[PDB]
Amino acid sequence: HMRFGRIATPDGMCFCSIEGEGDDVANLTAREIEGTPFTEPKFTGREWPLKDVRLLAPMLPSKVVAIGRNYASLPPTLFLKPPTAVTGPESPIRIPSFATKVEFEGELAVVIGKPCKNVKADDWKSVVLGFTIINDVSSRDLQFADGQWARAKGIDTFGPIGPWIETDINSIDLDNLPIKARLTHDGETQLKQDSNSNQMIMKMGEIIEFITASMTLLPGDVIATGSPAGTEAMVDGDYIEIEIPGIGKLGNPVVDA
Amino acid sequence: HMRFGRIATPDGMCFCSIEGEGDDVANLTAREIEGTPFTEPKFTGREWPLKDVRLLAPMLPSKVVAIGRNYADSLPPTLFLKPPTAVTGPESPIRIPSFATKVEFEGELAVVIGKPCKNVKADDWKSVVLGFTIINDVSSRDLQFADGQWARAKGIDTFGPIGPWIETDINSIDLDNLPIKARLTHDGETQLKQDSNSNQMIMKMGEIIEFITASMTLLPGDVIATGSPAGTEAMVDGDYIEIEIPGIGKLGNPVVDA
Ligand SMILES: [Mg+2]
Ligand SMILES: [Mg+2]
Ligand SMILES: [Mg+2]
């Protein structure tokens, strides 16, 4: 099945299908569709080289439910990031002056496909539209000061999502999926996160079961399935780029608000 | 000026204005409004005696932002979120799942946001509020302890009753002296199990709004739960809980095992 994105246009914006070979934007074509990812696609015929077009968050979720402490001591835990934290590829992560020690977190993100409640673990594939990347940006100093993580992870722009939604969920092997983050600081880039979905303590089905036992999930809701708990701080001028092979890259410049 | 609600009627759901004296539903009338309450509201002409329709949660908020540790009588006040899916209306059951134990209520003054805003200065807070309502910030104390993050304990479906309507004359409410009371009916006996006052707040209204909006954009319909004492009384299947805030009214919900 297809890859679905959203892009700026001159008339505003539109969903598209992303077609072509790599994860590499240079080989890819955005083809405009009418409708959403939730219905049967038909194409208007406007098509762009992906390098020429501005990708947006592939979905504007009613809520983002995130799992803390899910990466190989306290058990995995649920928290929320507000819909206002969500932004897209190349949008600035805008850091307020009072938010310090701000770190990235590359995570595999799941998009819910249909309304669901009390989903059993091995039935999880039936409620998922696809996978995407989220950068669960957090001020570690606020996280610590506040106790509840909501403010430190819920500042506007602290949830980049993208670059598109991969609906072919069998293409993604969850026993071995690298999740990488490359940080550029003072003009140099290093690999600052190197994890793998095989490190997840609660696996995909358990997560969905765990969440939906408590709360109803709606189409377009995003689940952030976790990361290592401490990474590396980012500052004005940096660039952070998460890569999950098979999905693509989610990059964002970092600026002072 | 107005009290705004949402109602279910034989014809479907709508926004409405609630008119008449008192808190007494026999005396009140619902007047359908055109569209939503954020603009100058226009009546469509349809109306019902309040007794013939059903109050719903007065908004469908994009998010619910809540403050912990905001009542005096220490770690400073802290913000958290309740998901929109937690929201329910007056008289709807609070449905407690089996894994959720020591479930307590918390009566709170709720603020409903009236326009999109960010970086609001504390002393400009009134310009962004539509009005006041009541929220019951229902919380599994056991899950709050097991999870550390309160999101699940407070975010289970139905754990955010809101209502009964939104009071837009916000000056009619004395934030320096607002009693907030809760009566729990257990085993057919009703007792006062919360007796607080908004003048116990550590961050006052304007500072809460500044604090929140310094971090997060707020949208029309978004709800702020301004706090409560951190411990009340556990509720079980069969109980009934009613929060009362004079000037707004009463928010009652039955309790059931999910
Ligand atoms: Mg995270
Ligand atoms: Mg009709
Ligand atoms: Mg509370």
**HEC profile of A17-72:** EEEECCCCHHHEEEEEEECCCCCCCEEEEEEEEHHHCCECCCCCCCCEEEEECCEC
Whole-angstrom distance, CA of residue B196 vs CA of residue B177: 10
Instruction: Tell how strand B64-68 and strand B78-82 pair up.
Output: antiparallel
Cα distances (angstroms) measured from residue B105 to each of B76, B241, B244: 21, 8, 13
Q: Are residues B36 and B95 in the same domain?
A: no
Of A151, A154, A214, the CB nearest to B152: A214
Whole-angstrom distance, CA of residue A110 vs CA of residue A206: 13
Give the Cβ contact number of residue A159 at 10 Å.
27
B156 touches chain A (CB under 8 A): yes
Judge: B78–A216 Cβ closer than 8 Å, yes or no: no
Give the Cβ contact number of residue A27 at 10 Å.
13
Whole-angstrom distance, CA of residue A122 vs CA of residue B79: 35
Q: Are residues A36 and A82 in the same domain?
A: no
Structural tokens at position A53: 């077009």
When computed from its CA atoms, the radius of gyration of chain B, rounded to whole angstroms, is 17
The H or E element containing residue A138 is: strand A138-139
Q: Are residues A25 and A93 in the same domain?
A: no
> A22, A40, A58: which is the final residue of a domain?
A58
B80 touches chain A (CB under 8 A): yes
User: What CATH number has the domain bearing residue B44?
Assistant: 2.30.30.370
Whole-angstrom distance, CA of residue B46 vs CA of residue B33: 8
Interval between CA B85 and ligand 3 midpoint (Å): 17
A75 touches chain B (CB under 8 A): yes
> How much of chain A is helix, strand and coil, in % rounded to 5?
15, 45, 40
Judge: A150–B63 Cβ closer than 8 Å, yes or no: no
Q: Are residues B8 and B127 in the same domain?
A: no
For chains A and B, count residue pairs whose Cβ atoms are closer than 8 Å: 92
- Output the CA angle B88-B92-B96, nearest 5 degrees: 85
Whole-angstrom distance, CA of residue A150 vs CA of residue A60: 19
Secondary structure (DSSP) of B113-143 = E-S-BSS--GGGGGGGEEEEEEEE--EEHHH
Interval between CA B34 and ligand 2 midpoint (Å): 15
Interval between CA B226 and ligand 3 midpoint (Å): 7
Judge: A77–B149 Cβ closer than 8 Å, yes or no: yes
Query: Collapsing DSSP states into helix, strand and coil, what is residue A98?
Result: coil
Q: Residues B153, B143: contact at Cβ < 8 Å? A: yes
Q: Residues B212, B224: contact at Cβ < 8 Å? A: yes
Residue whose token pair is 């504390």: B122
Q: Residues B111, B223: contact at Cβ < 8 Å? A: yes
Q: Which of B105, B82, B84 is nearest to B242 (CA)?
A: B105
Structural tokens at position A156: 């506007």
Q: Cα–chain-centroid distance for residue B43?
A: 25
Solving technique for this entry? Answer: X-ray
Backbone breaks in chain A after residues (C–N over 2.5 Å) = 72
> B16, B38, B58: which is the final residue of a domain?
B58
Q: Are residues A51 and A132 in the same domain?
A: no
A148 touches chain B (CB under 8 A): yes
Q: Residues A192, A182: contact at Cβ < 8 Å? A: yes
Amino acid sitting at position B123: D
- Output the CA angle B118-B207-B149, nearest 5 degrees: 80
Residue A188 known to bind ligand: no
Instruction: List CB contacts of A184: < 8 A, sequence separation 6 or more.
Output: A238, A239, A240, A241
Q: Are residues B120 and B242 in the same domain?
A: yes
Q: Are residues A152 and A176 in the same domain?
A: yes
Give B-chain residues touching A215 at CB under 8 angstroms.
Answer: 83, 85-86, 155-157
Q: Are residues A79 and A27 in the same domain?
A: no
Q: Residues A238, A185: contact at Cβ < 8 Å? A: yes
B230 touches chain A (CB under 8 A): no
Give long-range contacts, CB 8 A cutoff, 24+ apart: A33-41.
A37/A4, A37/A129, A37/A165, A37/A167, A38/A113, A38/A129, A38/A219, A41/A2, A41/A17
> A58, A76, A103: which is the final residue of a domain?
A58
Residue whose token pair is 């089905």: A205
Q: Are residues A182 and A66 in the same domain?
A: yes
Interval between CA B52 and ligand 2 midpoint (Å): 16
Whole-angstrom distance, CA of residue B24 vs CA of residue B20: 9
Task: Compute φ and ψ for B26, nearest 5 degrees.
Answer: -65, -25
Evaluate the CA torsion angle A148, A210, B159, A57 in order and state its sign.
Answer: positive
Q: Which domain holds residue B14?
A: 1-58
Residue in chain A lying closest to B157 (CA)? A215
The H or E element containing residue A210 is: helix A204-212
Instruction: List CB contacts of A191: < 8 A, sequence separation 6 or more.
Output: A180, A181, A182
For B143-179, what is the HEC assignment?
HHHHHCCCHHHHHCCCCEEEEEEEECCHHHCCCCCCE
Structural tokens at position A191: 């690999």
Q: Which of B62, B225, B226, B214 is nearest to A155 (CA)?
A: B214
In A, residues 184-213, which contact B (CB 8 Å cutoff)?
213
Q: Are residues A33 and A160 in the same domain?
A: no
Instruction: Tell how strand A138-139 and strand A178-185 pair up.
Output: unpaired
Q: Which of B40, B36, B21 is nearest to B249 (CA)?
A: B21
A149 touches chain B (CB under 8 A): yes
Cα distances (angstroms) measured from residue A132 to each of A84, B187, B241: 18, 50, 42
Whole-angstrom distance, CA of residue B100 vs CA of residue B104: 10
Cα distances (angstroms) measured from residue A114 to each of A86, A215, A220, B258: 20, 14, 8, 22
Q: Residues A153, A141: contact at Cβ < 8 Å? A: no
Cα distances (angstroms) measured from residue A196 to each of A137, A201, B101: 18, 11, 35
User: What CATH number has the domain bearing residue B195?
Assistant: 3.90.850.10
Whole-angstrom distance, CA of residue B164 vs CA of residue B16: 12
Whole-angstrom distance, CA of residue A63 vs CA of residue B83: 7
Q: How many distinct structural domains can be found in chain B?
A: 2
- Output the CA angle A10-A15-A16, nearest 5 degrees: 100
Which of A74, A116, A214 has the highest number of chain B CBs within 10 A, making it the mutation to test binding with B? A214
Q: Are residues A117 and A17 in the same domain?
A: no
Amino acid sitting at position A234: M
Give B-chain residues touching A158 at CB under 8 angstroms.
Answer: none
Exposed e or buried b per residue across B113-124, where buried means at least 16 C-beta atoms within 10 angstroms of its C-beta: bbeebeebeeee
Q: Are residues A223 and A150 in the same domain?
A: yes
Of B80, B97, B150, the CB nearest to A213: B97
Whole-angstrom distance, CA of residue A93 vs CA of residue A104: 10
Residue in chain A lying closest to B96 (CA)? A214
Q: Which of B227, B197, B200 is nearest to B212 (CA)?
A: B227
Which ligand number lies closest to the CA of residue A138?
Answer: 1
